[PDB]
Amino acid sequence: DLKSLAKRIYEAYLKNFNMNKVKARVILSPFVIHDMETLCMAEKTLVAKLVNKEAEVRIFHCCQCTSVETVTELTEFAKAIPGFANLDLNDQVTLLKYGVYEAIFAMLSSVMNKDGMLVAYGNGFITREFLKSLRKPFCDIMEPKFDFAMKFNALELDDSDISLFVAAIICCGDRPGLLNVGHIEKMQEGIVHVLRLHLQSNHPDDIFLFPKLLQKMADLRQLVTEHAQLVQIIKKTESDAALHPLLQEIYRDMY
Ligand SMILES: O=C(O)[C@H](Cc1ccccc1)Oc1ccc(-c2cccc3ccccc23)cc1
């Protein structure tokens, strides 16, 4: 009843996300981008988009491409959440608008380790060092995300846990401008119930796992606000680039 919903959500997650934590950890052992030199050759194989321009922009263009891919996937996933489809159109869109970036960063942790992160479906590996060497303000984009990932990854969740977490992020009753707050809260109530009990079953060796995750939720909301603004800065300060149209609509006057 509760069990089943966890199965249905986990399977939806498995069908709809190209990257998951089992597949990432397996990979994490091909091509390393660690300096401007190795970056260029990376751009002779991996990235088929910009295919000069300032290195900082090339990098984060490639990053926004993946954001958009994930927004697509999160939409597919959400449709498979029992009940989601039945929400008002405008609500489904508002939930995803305010939800996707929080969920993006949650799942990004899966491909990050203390050295760097998998990129482009796990065929690239850009070092944390390298990113930290990019000119301001670009060297300050990914650092807070690695910070979050190291704390998240310490909880040692698996995909079954993550799938329910991501569902709970999306189905959140307090996003600004919802119509049927009542119904979304009822949905949230159900999922969060399943999540807490699931964590207790799956990880009986950690009493406080569920509360730890609620704290991570708080962390991600702050992480997203900070990201929105640093994005805002870069839009004003740098025009050599341009933000993807779809991301422009998501970022718009939210936080
Ligand atoms: O939001 C995102 O998609 C990423 C963060 C992320 C990283 C890795 C995986 C998932 C998400 O942040 C971005 C940061 C910077 C730019 C960007 C690039 C070039 C020109 C720009 C001009 C103005 C504003 C922003 C510009 C795009 C996305």
**Nearest-angstrom CA–CA distance, 156 and 158:** 7
Q: What is the DSSP string of 97-123?
A: HHHHHHHHHHHHGGGB-SSEEEETTTT
Resolution of the solved structure (Å):
3.0
Ligand 1: distance of its center to the CA of 64 in Å? 5
| CB distance 228 to ligand 1 below 6 Å | no
CB 143 within 8 A of CB 132: yes
CB of 138 within 8 A of CB of 126?
no
CA–CA gap between residue 26 and residue 44 (Å, rounded) = 25
Contact 168, 188 (CB under 8 A): yes
Q: How far is the CA of 204 from the centre of ligand 1 (A)?
A: 39
124: which DSSP letter? E
Q: Could you tell me if residue 4 is left (phi over 0), alpha (psi between -120 and 50 degrees) or otherwise beta? A: left
Asked if residue 101 lies in contact with residue 247, where contact means CB atoms within 8 angstroms, the answer is no
User: Using CA positions, which residue lies closest to atom 16 of ligand 1?
Assistant: 60
Nearest CA to ligand 1 atom 24: 235
Distance 245 CA to ligand 1 centre (A): 12
Q: Whose CA is nearest to atom 15 of ligand 1?
A: 60
Question: Do the annotations mark residue 121 as ligand-binding?
Answer: no
Q: Give me ligand 1 centre to Cα 231, in Å.
A: 7
Residue identified by tokens 């449709």 is 79
Whether 244 lines ligand 1, by a CB cut-off of 6 Å, is no
d(CA 31, CA 10): 30
Find all residues with CB under 8 Å of 117, minimum gap 6, and list them. 108, 111, 125, 126, 128, 142, 146
Name the residue at shortest CA distance from atom 3 of ligand 1. 64
Q: Which of 56, 68, 119, 234 to mutate to test the pocket of ligand 1 (most atoms within 8 A of CB)?
A: 234
Q: Write down the experimental method used for this entry.
A: X-ray
Contact (Cβ atoms closer than 8 angstroms) between residue 74 and residue 249: no
Pick from 128, 148, 132: nearest CA to 140: 132
What tokens were used for 201?
């079953």
DSSP state for residue 207 in the 8-state scheme: T
Evaluate the CA torsion angle 72, 78, 79, 85 in order and state its sign: negative
Domains of the chain plus CATH, in order, are 5-251 (1.10.565.10)
Is 255 assigned a ligand-binding role in the annotation? Answer: no
- E strands within the chain? 31-33, 116-119, 124-127
CB 90 within 8 Å of CB 179: yes
Torsion of CA 2, 154, 169, 206, to 10 degrees: 30
